[PDB]
Design a protein around this ligand. Structure first.
Ligand SMILES: [Cl-]
Ligand SMILES: [Cl-]
Ligand SMILES: [Cu+2]
Ligand SMILES: [Cu+2]
Ligand SMILES: [Cu+2]
Ligand SMILES: [Cu+2]
Ligand SMILES: [Cu+2]
Ligand SMILES: [Cu+2]
Lengths: 285, 285, 285
């Protein structure tokens, strides 16, 4: 099918921790991460980027799901301008999207990133998931204007979905969100490492990845992995099943990353919310 | 079968180089790395942790081979307490174990880490190894109390099995240990990257990895790899066969890691000790 | 077949950026990277290294394609000396080669690295490439004598084939080289990450890796990867096909790397130079 996707480049204050601290983010649609885009393998995507008139900077859009021309298609547009391009989603899986404007390190760091999920045309290529969650890792830099700190890799926190310990009520009692499932359910994690700089060594504490798919592609399946390396600008699909009620903690096992905010709790309970990890709830905001 | 495994949390001084430099380590059973645990896929493990009465810190145990509840099973216990849990080893391969107590970066860095090997139920899934050796990479930090330096990734050395150049009598005149095999033999390396922070890019100088199994699982086999990336908190099984007498040097090929201590020599001789890499000589102490 | 490969260890000034900045490089055959070595799986390589009489340092040769003895074969030779050894290329793919002399971090950093390509004996094991390009990533250090800065990972730039933005006319007006292909053609990238220290997260902006081969080996094929991690001292083969005229930009997606020089443009045009990416043009000088 043909789908229309329109996003705004929006520069606005957003919260990055559980105590309400904010920073001047650069975003798609006013939130970090950007909106989940979801299509089927083979779909035509008619994409529109609107750079809001009140932006102070030029912005662009790079989809890792797209095969295009970097110079024309991923070009920067000024505040008040609108850009269109069309691409087919040729390969199934999970893909990073982000602003490609100058300097990319900063546009990514300030929050212009998201995921596009490309469902396999063959609905039987992946085992059926009972829950789906998006987790996007990024570094948070204390001063969004300081490009030198970014070049020097001097981050303040490493986070999932834009918030320090957003999903960790164990380590931060002010956290108000977490992942849910029932024991025995297949939980599918769509993971993107936005960077801009760091790698992630992703591990479910007290669990194991039942299966891992590099770039989300069924052909690349790996089994029973305790951990999986996701480089900067890479993405993978990782399945998790708990045999028991309780919790696992999804961590970036480079411990200084984990301690700085990269931990997400999943609670396994028999009375898990039927809406959790389904529908429009896959990226928990 | 059901296997009983009991470990003590023991805070004690241990050596970290070949000239007898010591640090105040936190350990399982008074040694770094902890005791090798070895079971068969499908086995029931009845585990007991005893936190010694003279410890000054709470400790815990996290097995990457276990599928449990992080909150109750991996909970920290006080000096003088004893904790029990049972798990089945559902997946074959090679798995990191470590203390999970706060802050994990420090409990790992201070020496609370080891390996559990889960032999495949199908003893013919893996090609028969003639020798087996455990190598666990970790960073050593000069001051075990300086958590800031750990968070800044400012390690003093990167080491195998707790010692600077432990197995490198070429670069260290004071080194007395090395790995042994005969030409033509299949040498199986059980490798864990304990971290806490760093990645390892593992290469046998003058050799090639015949096979590499991510998380040690036979289903994930890779062939003829010059190098293999093991992220912090990950493990893999790597096979090596020399066609000639002489040496290879197993290194973390991120050269600043290798030069800081992460080199292990394997000697291939026709008269290799029939006891080396067999029984409980697999982790050379 | 048996092939003779002779290289010289040459210490000489070479350019490392598009404005003609030079440094005192240590090299094979007076250029950085060294000459491309290409043989077929099963071939016998009769190798000779001659250390030039005017060299000030001892040098050696380490082929990741060789299974030998680190002690005797990879030994260092003084200025005016010659080392000879023979090896069979037992495994197909793509392999790092470099000086292995004390300290390896500096010998690599100063330019003593290259690639050996080992074509599969089975001509059909890889899909047929229409273009081939060699890309070797390395860190450039400001002062080639400052070993402490290397040990501390304080690099100035991360580069492909010895040059800051060597193939990026888009981000550097003084860049005079880039990769060329036609739309629809299979472009094969032989990628080596020489390090000495850093990881690469390789991504074609506006494209996708059709296939990736860890160590170049047909047995390890992965499909449709957006990005691929190449550790220090590792190598891989990566195929790229653009369906359209335009450009892709091959980048190390750890952005502080890319912005420091690690970006190579490939131009897809209907009248690409028939000589580009063929014969001995594959490593563009
Ligand atoms: Cl032991
Ligand atoms: Cl045991
Ligand atoms: Cu932007
Ligand atoms: Cu990208
Ligand atoms: Cu502990
Ligand atoms: Cu762990
Ligand atoms: Cu040299
Ligand atoms: Cu090497």
């Amino acid at each position: 099918k043909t789908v229309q996707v329109t996003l705004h480049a929006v520069e606005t204050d957003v919260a990055y921790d559980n105590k309400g601290s904010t920073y001047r983010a650069w975003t798609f649609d006013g939130k970090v991460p950007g909106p989940v885009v979801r299509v089927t393998e083979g779909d035509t995507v008619e994409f529109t980027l609107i750079n809001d008139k009140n932006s102070k900077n030029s912005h662009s859009m790079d989809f890792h799901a797209a095969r295009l021309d970097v110079v024309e298609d991923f070009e920067s547009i000024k505040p008040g301008e609108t850009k269109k391009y069309t691409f087919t989603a040729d390969n199934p899986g999970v893909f990073f999207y982000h602003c490609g404007s100058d300097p990319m390190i900063q546009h990514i760091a300030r929050g212009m990133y998201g995921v596009i999920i490309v469902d396999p045309k063959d609905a039987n290529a992946l085992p059926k998931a009972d829950r789906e969650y998006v987790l996007i890792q990024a570094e948070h830099y204390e001063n969004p204007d300081d490009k030198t700190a970014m070049m020097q890799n001097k981050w303040s926190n490493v986070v999932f979905n834009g918030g320090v310990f957003k999903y960790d009520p164990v380590h931060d009692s002010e956290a108000t969100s977490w992942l849910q499932a029932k024991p025995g359910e297949r939980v599918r994690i769509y993971f993107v490492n936005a960077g801009p700089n760091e790698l992630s060594s992703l591990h479910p504490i007290a669990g194991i990845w039942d299966r891992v798919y590099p770039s989300g592609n069924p052909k690349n399946v790996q089994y029973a992995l305790q951990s999986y390396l996701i480089g900067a600008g890479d993405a993978a699909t990782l399945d998790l099943i708990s045999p028991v009620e309780g919790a696992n903690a999804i961590v970036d096992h480079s411990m200084r990353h984990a301690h700085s905010g990269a931990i997400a709790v999943i609670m396994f309970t028999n009375d898990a919310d039927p809406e959790a990890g389904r529908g429009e709830n896959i990226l928990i905001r």
